[PDB]
Amino acid sequence: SKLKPFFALVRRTNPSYGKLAFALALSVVTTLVSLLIPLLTKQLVDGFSMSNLSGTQIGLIALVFFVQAGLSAYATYALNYNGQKIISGLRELLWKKLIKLPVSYFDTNASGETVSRVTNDTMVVKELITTHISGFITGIISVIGSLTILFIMNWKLTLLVLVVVPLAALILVPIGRKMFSISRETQDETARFTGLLNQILPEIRLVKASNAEDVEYGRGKMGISSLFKLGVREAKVQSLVGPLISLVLMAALVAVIGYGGMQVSSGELTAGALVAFILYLFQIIMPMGQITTFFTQLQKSIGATERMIEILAEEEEDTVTGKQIENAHLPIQLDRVSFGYKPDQLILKEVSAVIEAGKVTAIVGPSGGGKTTLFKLLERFYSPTAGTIRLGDEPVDTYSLESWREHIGYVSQESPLMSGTIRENICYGLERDVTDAEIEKAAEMAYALNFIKELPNQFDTEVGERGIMLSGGQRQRIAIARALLRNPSILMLDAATSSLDSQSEKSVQQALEVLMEGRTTIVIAHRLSTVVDADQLLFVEKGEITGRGTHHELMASHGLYRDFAEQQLKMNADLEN
Amino acid sequence: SKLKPFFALVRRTNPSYGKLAFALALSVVTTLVSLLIPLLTKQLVDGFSMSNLSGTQIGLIALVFFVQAGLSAYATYALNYNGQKIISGLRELLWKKLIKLPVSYFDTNASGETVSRVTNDTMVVKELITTHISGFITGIISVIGSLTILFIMNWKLTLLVLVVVPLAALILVPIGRKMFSISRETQDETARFTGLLNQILPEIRLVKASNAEDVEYGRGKMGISSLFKLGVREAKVQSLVGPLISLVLMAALVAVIGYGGMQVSSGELTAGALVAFILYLFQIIMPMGQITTFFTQLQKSIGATERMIEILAEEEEDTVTGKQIENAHLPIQLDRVSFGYKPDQLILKEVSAVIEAGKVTAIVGPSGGGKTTLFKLLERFYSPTAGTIRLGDEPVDTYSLESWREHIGYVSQESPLMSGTIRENICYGLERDVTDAEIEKAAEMAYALNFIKELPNQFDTEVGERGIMLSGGQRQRIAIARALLRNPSILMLDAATSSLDSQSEKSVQQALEVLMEGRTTIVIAHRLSTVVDADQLLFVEKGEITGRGTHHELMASHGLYRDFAEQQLKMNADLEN
Ligand SMILES: Nc1ncnc2c1ncn2[C@@H]1O[C@H](COP(=O)(O)OP(=O)(O)OP(=O)(O)O)[C@@H](O)[C@H]1O
Ligand SMILES: Nc1ncnc2c1ncn2[C@@H]1O[C@H](COP(=O)(O)OP(=O)(O)OP(=O)(O)O)[C@@H](O)[C@H]1O
Numbered sequence A, B: 001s002k003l004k005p006f007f008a009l010v011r012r013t014n015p016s017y018g019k020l021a022f023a024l025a026l027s028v029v030t031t032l033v034s035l036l037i038p039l040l041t042k043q044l045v046d047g048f049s050m051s052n053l054s055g056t057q058i059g060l061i062a063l064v065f066f067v068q069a070g071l072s073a074y075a076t077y078a079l080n081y082n083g084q085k086i087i088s089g090l091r092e093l094l095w096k097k098l099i100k101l102p103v104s105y106f107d108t109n110a111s112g113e114t115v116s117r118v119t120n121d122t123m124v125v126k127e128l129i130t131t132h133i134s135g136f137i138t139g140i141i142s143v144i145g146s147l148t149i150l151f152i153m154n155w156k157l158t159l160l161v162l163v164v165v166p167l168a169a170l171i172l173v174p175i176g177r178k179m180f181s182i183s184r185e186t187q188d189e190t191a192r193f194t195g196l197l198n199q200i201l202p203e204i205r206l207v208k209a210s211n212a213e214d215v216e217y218g219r220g221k222m223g224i225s226s227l228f229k230l231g232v233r234e235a236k237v238q239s240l241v242g243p244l245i246s247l248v249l250m251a252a253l254v255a256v257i258g259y260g261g262m263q264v265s266s267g268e269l270t271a272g273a274l275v276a277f278i279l280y281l282f283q284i285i286m287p288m289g290q291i292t293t294f295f296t297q298l299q300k301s302i303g304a305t306e307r308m309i310e311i312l313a314e315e316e317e318d319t320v321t322g323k324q325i326e327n328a329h330l331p332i333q334l335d336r337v338s339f340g341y342k343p344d345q346l347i348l349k350e351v352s353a354v355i356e357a358g359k360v361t362a363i364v365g366p367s368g369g370g371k372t373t374l375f376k377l378l379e380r381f382y383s384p385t386a387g388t389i390r391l392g393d394e395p396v397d398t399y400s401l402e403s404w405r406e407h408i409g410y411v412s413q414e415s416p417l418m419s420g421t422i423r424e425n426i427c428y429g430l431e432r433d434v435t436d437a438e439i440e441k442a443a444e445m446a447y448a449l450n451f452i453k454e455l456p457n458q459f460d461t462e463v464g465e466r467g468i469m470l471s472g473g474q475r476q477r478i479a480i481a482r483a484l485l486r487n488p489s490i491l492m493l494d495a496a497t498s499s500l501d502s503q504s505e506k507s508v509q510q511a512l513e514v515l516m517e518g519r520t521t522i523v524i525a526h527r528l529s530t531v532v533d534a535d536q537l538l539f540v541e542k543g544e545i546t547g548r549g550t551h552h553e554l555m556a557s558h559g560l561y562r563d564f565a566e567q568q569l570k571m572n573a574d575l576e577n
C-alpha cells in the first residue's frame, strides 16, 4: 500500500517521458545485443579472418562502438535529466504547498524541520530514478531472456529455478521492511538536525552571550552521532543484500544437483547440457543483484518520502469564495467570539466588541491577556471556535481572504524583516511598480527617511538575516513603513511604538494621525500615554474585555486597573518632582 | 593544488583505517582472483569431470562462493561504515568550528547558508568515499595487471597503448575542470535555497499578513530552477565521460592497426597473438571507465568542499589567555573608544565614560544612536578600533573571555528564545544542576512565576520556534529570568522593559532593584520614566555622549534634548488633564 501513493506522487509532477522511454528503449536494445553475443562468439573466429581479408571493416566496427556506448551515454543523460525533472518538480510542488498551509500548521509543526523536506528529502529520491531504474529495466529483461534461454535447453530444471526465485523474494521482503523503517528514521533525524542547527545559529549572540559554546556543541554532536548510528545501521542492512542472494544460488545449485540425482541417472550422457545449464546459472546472478539493489533502493526512497507524501494533503484555502470587500469602510462587529490555540484551553472567552469605522480604538491590557491573538483572530489567520466576526451584519467568512487581506495593514509585535534591500522589505508583496515617490512618502510617514539616507540609500542597504543589520528602532520604523505603504483601509499596530524613542514616537504618531484620519486604525499600547486621544478603549484582561469606552469615562468607571493608569501617572510624577 | 587540502581534511578527522585497509585488501584479492580466472577457464573442463567423479566437492565450491561474495559484502560494509565515519567526523569538526567564530563572521556571512554548509555538503562528499574509491582501487590494479598481461605477449604494442593512456588523461583534465566549476556552483546554490527558504518560513505570519504567497512562491521557483541549471548541466558533462573514453580506445585500435602496418608484414604468421591482444584490449575498457568515474566524482567532491575548507580557518578565540576575573565589582572605565561595524563608517565616535561599580547608570538616547552596539562593545563581541575598555586601570583584553562572560548577564533587544522547555531557556548554558527552588526564585524575580503556572508548569511548556508559543511580554520576562538566574556581577538590560505592561514593569523593577542593590546594573530606557532613580545617565546621540551625570543636573544642564524628557512630561500631562 506504500507503492501507490509514491508513484502517484511521481505521476503528480511532469516527468520527461520523451527522454525516459527513449533511455528505456536504448537499455532494451543494449541488453538484447548482450543476449545475442553468445551466438556471435562462435562467429568471431571466422569474422576475424573475413576482416583481415577485407580490411576496412574494423573501422566500421569502431563506428559501431562509437555508436553504442555513445548512444548508451545518451541513455545516461536521458535518465539523469529526467531525474532532475522529477525532484525539481517535487520542490516546485512541495514549496507551492508549504506557503499555503494555514498558520495553525506552523504553530503545531516547527518550520525549521519542514525546510529539510523541500531540500533534503527530495534529493534522496535521486538514486532510485538516476541509476536504479536503469538497473531494474536491464536486469528484469536479462533474467527473463536468460530464463527462456535456460528453458529451451531444459524444462524441469528451469521450473526448479523458477521456484527458487520467489524464495529470494520472500527472503528479500523483511530486508525491505527494515530498510523502510531505517530510511524513515534517517530522513526524520536529518530534519531535526537541520533544525537544532538552524534554530541555534541565528541566535549566536545568545550562545556567545551566555557561555554555551560547550553545551550547544553538545546538542550538535548528539545529532551528528544519531545520523551516524541511523546511517551505519542502514549500511549494515545493505550488507545483508550480498550474501543472502548467494544463498538462493546455493539453494538452486543444490536443487539442480538433487534433480541431477535422477538427472545423472538419465543423463550421464547429457552432462554437457548440465555444464551449459550451470554456466548460464552462473551468468544469471548479476542481474539478480541489480534487481535486489533496485528493490532496496526503492524501499529506502519510499521510507524517505513517507513523511513528505502527507505534507501534500493539508487543505490550503486562499481564494475559494472570491467575494470582494468592495468598499471596506464598515464597522467591524464581534459576536460572542471565543478562541484558543489548543482546543482544550480558551484564550478568548466570549469576547464581544464593535470597532467603529473611522475612529481609533486601542486595545490596552496586561501582558498575556489576549491582544495579539485577538488581532490574529481579526485577520482570520484563525477561525474562532464560537460565533464569528461580521462587517455590518455580514459575516467575514463570505469574503475572500485575498481581497480582504489586501485591505488591512499589520505591524506585528516582532517587527519582522527579511534579507534583501530596505526597498524590498518596504515593497514586500506588492504587485505594482512601487516606483520611488510612493516609498519616499511612506518612509517619510514612518519617520524612516531621515535615517535611511545616512546609510547608502535604500537599495545598497542589506538588512541581513532577520533584520540584524539595522537597529531595534529602525526595523520597527521599517515595519511601520511597510504597513503604511500599501494604504490600508484598516491599520493594525500590534505595539508599533514599542522600541522607539520618545521623539520618534511623537513624529510617527503625528504623521499617522495625519494620514489615517478617515479610516480605521486599531493600535495596542502597552503604556497608556499614546492612546489618550483614542476614540475608544478596550481593556483586555485574561481574554475578557473588562472595560470599554472613551478613556475618561473608562478611567472614571473602571475599578482596580484605573490604578494601572495611575501608576503611569506616578511614573511620570516623580519626573515632575 | 586542490587535492592536498582536501586530503588533509579527510586526514584531519579520524577515519576507520582498520576497516578501510581491510576492504582494500579484499578488493585486491578479489581482483587477483578475477585476473587468475582466464588461467583456470581451461582447467574447468576437466575439473567438471573430476567433480562428477568425486562428488561432494561442488558443495565445497558453494562454500567458496559463500565465502567470496559474503567476504565481498563485508568489503562494502567496511567501506560504507568508513564513509559514515568521515562525514560524521566532518560535521563533528565543522560544527565545532561554527559556534566558535566571532560574531563579526555572522554579521558578514548569513548563517542560514552556513547551516547547509554542514548538512548539504558533507553528504555530497559521501559518494567519492562509499563506492567510487573502490573503483580506483579495483581499476588501478586491473589495468596494471592486464597491462603486464599484454606486455608478456607483446612489447611495442604494449608501449603503444601505454602511450595512449596519457592521451585519455589530457582529454580527461578539462572535464575535471568543468566538473569542479559546476559542483562549486551547485553547493553554493543549494545553500542559498536552504537559506532563502528557511529565512522565509519562520516569517509565515508576514507572508500571510501581506499577500505575498504568489511572490514568494515565485522566488522559490527561481531557486528550484537554478538548482536544475547546476544539475542538468553537470549531468551533461558526465555524459561526456562515456564516449570520450571510447575515443581513446578508437585511437589505440587504430594505433594497433597503425603498427599492424609492419606487424602484419612480420606477423601474418602471428595473427592469433594479435587476436588475443585485441581481445584483452577489449577487456581493459571497463576498469578505465571505473577510473574515469572516480576522477569525475573526485573533482565533484573537491568542488563541493572548496567552500567548506575555508570555514575551518577563521580564528576562534575563546579562552586563550586564561586570566580569571576576580573582584568584578570594579568600575568599568572607557578610554577614547571608537568602533564601527564596517571599518569605513564609525558608529562610536571617541566615546568615553565611567560606569561606577554598584550604581545604576542608564544609557538614554534617540534611536540609531549607538546604545546596543555600545553594549556589544562592553561584552567584547567586538574589539574597539580605538583605545580599549579597562577595569580599574587594567585593560579588559587580559582577562579570559570565558571567565568574564560568566559574570555579565545580558538581556538583548529581541529577547531571543530557542525551542525547548521554559526550564531549558531559563537554565540555558549553565553547568550546575540548577535546582527548582532556584529557578522558582529567578522567575519570581522576573515576574514570570505568576504566569507560567497557568500554563502546564515549566517542563511541559514548549516555546516553539523562536519563542512563538509565548507572548511578546512573556518571552521578555523569560529573558529577564535568564539574566537574573545566574546571579551576575554586572547586569545589562538592552531595553528589558520594552514590551511589558505598566504593572509588570513596576513589579520587575521593584524585584530587580531589591536583588541588585550591591552590584552594577546598566539599563537602556527608550522612555525616561523608569530611570529617573538611576544614579547616572549617559545621553548617547549619533555615537557621541552629549550628556552625562545625574538626571536632575543633566536635565538642568542639557540643551535641546531636555525637551526629549519634557515631551514625555506632556505625554503624561494630557493624561492628567
Ligand atoms: N501558538 C501560539 N501563539 C501565540 N500565543 C499563544 C500560542 N499558544 C498559546 N498562546 C497563548 O496566547 C497568549 C499570548 O497571546 P496574547 O494576545 O495574550 O499576547 P499579548 O496580549 O499581545 O501579550 P503582550 O500584550 O504582553 O504582548 C499567551 O497566554 C500564550 O500562552
Ligand atoms: N551588523 C550590525 N549590527 C547592528 N548594528 C549595525 C550593524 N551594522 C551597522 N549597524 C548600525 O548600528 C546602529 C544600530 O546600533 P545601535 O546601538 O544604534 O542601536 P540602538 O541605539 O540600540 O537603537 P535603539 O536604541 O533604537 O534600539 C545602526 O545605526 C546601524 O546602522
Ligand SMILES: [Mg+2]
Pocket: A471, A472, A473, B371, B372, B413
Ligand atoms: Mg537597539
Ligand SMILES: [Mg+2]
Pocket: A371, A372, A413, B471, B472, B473
Ligand atoms: Mg503580544
